[PDB]
Amino acid sequence: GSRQVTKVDCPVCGVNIPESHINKHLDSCLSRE
């Protein structure tokens, strides 16, 4: 019941960002090799 955009860390490239952008970040950041 938290009416706010949650700010959390991207465990790949180590950046603190909003959660909508954390999810999207991963899709780019996990693309390795």
Binding site: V12, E19, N23, L30, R32
Partner: protein
Amino acid sequence: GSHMQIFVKTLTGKTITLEVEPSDTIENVKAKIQDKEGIPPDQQRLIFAGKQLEDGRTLSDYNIQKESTLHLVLRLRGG
């Protein structure tokens, strides 16, 4: 058939202890975070050391042993 404990720690800093094998599968592990905190494998995401943990693979595949600590990305996209 056994159960080993691994520490899947969220971005909110909360630690979820699961009871699965290193040679089990990631698909099972994420189903067990849903079994513990009550958040589905859709709304949570498995990442160890910066690598995403694929459903078809195992913990042991991704260099994850029993009692390894890894990161869990909450999404809460359902609302």
